[PDB]
Structure 1
């Protein structure tokens, strides 16, 4: 009966501990209590409380889709990190399971999680390059070598998650974080993650991902599996190359109905892209998932595509390129 007793020992306290203890505790969330995974963040007398033990950086800047991610500092240690707020009432444990104990360089490092009142505060390493989405806004669009470089890295993270039977569920540039120099990319924002065998995504309370990157099986209410992440990642590739999401420049009225009815958006592949770049995007945008490339398959092909155009040579932030 021991799992029960391990969980009760964690409840009512913030402790220094390991990812597996955190995941056990967070399942009861899905008053001050949590597990912190690094000695950079430390509890003080069984507690870790906002504005008492850790402080958000002033003035409060606000990042993420809901401005729910902030820079913060542990008052005792002085170490800085990022914190994501999730409302307790809609917290999904899968978000932690996707990044807890997952020592992979393409997954944002998790430093811990603490429940305080109506919040779940999720602590993680601070990546200073900004998001891939922000990078696209600033540059207009990315050159092909850089676009192949970051898609590869994203697919390395999806390989990792898929091998663990975890599906990201919202793969897009806004959820890829860059290192301070731009050379390392990491998946974040696992709030739509799902633990797998495949079956329909559209049942009960499920909150789905971003409409423009939705795979047709998601939209039609069909059996979904890891392959939905591949579709989205190729929609992300189109976003990088063109500087706008797929589907938006040909349709405006509800985009989910076009994804069901129309052929995939392979016409949005730029003419100037090299053959294998085009080939790879086509293999990730096959409508039926059985015919669509896995993460492993597509990552190998995106790797070769990049080699075929001379490797990564463009600077991280070059000159502006107007979106088509």
Structure 2
């Protein structure tokens, strides 16, 4: 009843506020409005404006697929964090509604969101350890124990999301961000995020093709499990130093995912029995037979123990891809 009036109060201003306010306001985003969820990012006289109240680093780098994430500093508090720019016309509400209010070490925290013209600027914690995606290029591929250690942590994050009926929609090494020392990993980029109970309808944006599940490619309905398929495509990416299918095929990798059997052949034979079996559960074509996050996280935990826990260093010597 009063919801109408609360939305109006938030509009036209940037305020220090709370996740529930941000979600309400964000829904209006299909001149300077927004909510900041942390003390460290303060608006000034109802405003928070690029190059006035917050400065993007003048060296200027570009993280993310579209060079859309940047290092930034709030001019007054001097607090540093990251900003994802989303085009306003493309902006999907779920990216925040999923992300907002979430408290978990396996998820990158949201610090707020502010609209300014054709942009939505989404603020978040800065992780200086880079992406798992960068780690793989850097070190070619990863050792079995490291690989399991991280997949487990990704799976821990997916549990959290699925308990709240949220689908990440694009699980992939690029979207797993590491800490300074590399002991902790967290999921980021909820730009394909959905709420749960068909998939292919209208304003929906699809994930990475190589990491895409069969039910999605074909078009059957989808559940939490589509993330599980991706997470294991990512497992393989960590082990072999390249995405599945790419080594074996050139033209349209989608039709290959549907017709061909799961790419379990890409599991290096030198993996332990359980490591291989865990991945096999995760990549079963049919969601009903495929494992859930809870089931796979448990199996992955076991496989790590089975190879004597996390031995190998965080910056081991480069290993050759397959």
TM-score by length of 1: 0.99
The total of aligned residue pairs comes to: 322
Structure 1 stretches (4+) deviating beyond 2 angstroms? none
Cα deviation 1:218-244 (Å, max 9, x = unaligned)? 000111110000000000000000000
Cα deviation 1:39-82 (Å, max 9, x = unaligned)? 11000000000000000011111110000000000000000000
**Cα deviation, residue 149, structure 1:** 0.4
Cα deviation 1:157-179 (Å, max 9, x = unaligned)? 10000010100000000000001
**Cα deviation, residue 5, structure 1:** 1.3
Other structure's SS at 2:288 match: coil
Other structure's SS at 1:212 match: coil
Other structure's SS at 2:28 match: helix
Between the aligned partners of 2:55 and 2:215, the Cα distance in structure 1 is: 43
Cα deviation 1:174-208 (Å, max 9, x = unaligned)? 000001100110100100000011xx111112110
Other structure's SS at 1:108 match: coil
Between the aligned partners of 1:183 and 1:4, the Cα distance in structure 2 is: 45
**Cα deviation, residue 30, structure 1:** 2.7
Other structure's SS at 2:250 match: coil
Other structure's SS at 2:192 match: coil
> Of the candidates 281, 303, 306, which is equivalent to residue 305 of structure 1?
303
Between the aligned partners of 2:30 and 2:224, the Cα distance in structure 1 is: 23
**Cα deviation, residue 6, structure 1:** 1.3
Between the aligned partners of 2:58 and 2:205, the Cα distance in structure 1 is: 32
**Cα deviation, residue 128, structure 1:** 0.7
**Cα deviation, residue 98, structure 1:** 2.2
Other structure's SS at 2:99 match: coil
- 1:66 is matched with which residue? 66
- 2:166 is matched with which residue? 166
Other structure's SS at 1:149 match: helix
Other structure's SS at 1:102 match: coil
Between the aligned partners of 1:279 and 1:196, the Cα distance in structure 2 is: 28
Cα deviation 1:4-41 (Å, max 9, x = unaligned)? 11111100000001111101100100310100011110
Other structure's SS at 1:224 match: coil
Cα deviation 1:117-157 (Å, max 9, x = unaligned)? 00000000011100000000000000000000000000011
Between the aligned partners of 1:228 and 1:30, the Cα distance in structure 2 is: 26
- 1:22 is matched with which residue? 22
Over the aligned positions, Cα root-mean-square deviation in angstroms equals 0.6
Other structure's SS at 2:111 match: strand
Unaligned runs of 5+ in 1: none
TM-score by length of 2: 0.99
Between the aligned partners of 1:240 and 1:153, the Cα distance in structure 2 is: 14
**Cα deviation, residue 101, structure 1:** 0.5
Between the aligned partners of 1:49 and 1:57, the Cα distance in structure 2 is: 15
Between the aligned partners of 1:74 and 1:45, the Cα distance in structure 2 is: 15
Unaligned runs of 5+ in 2: none
Are 2:223 and 1:225 aligned?
A: yes
**Cα deviation, residue 280, structure 1:** 0.4
Between the aligned partners of 2:109 and 2:175, the Cα distance in structure 1 is: 14
Between the aligned partners of 2:219 and 2:102, the Cα distance in structure 1 is: 30
Other structure's SS at 2:210 match: helix
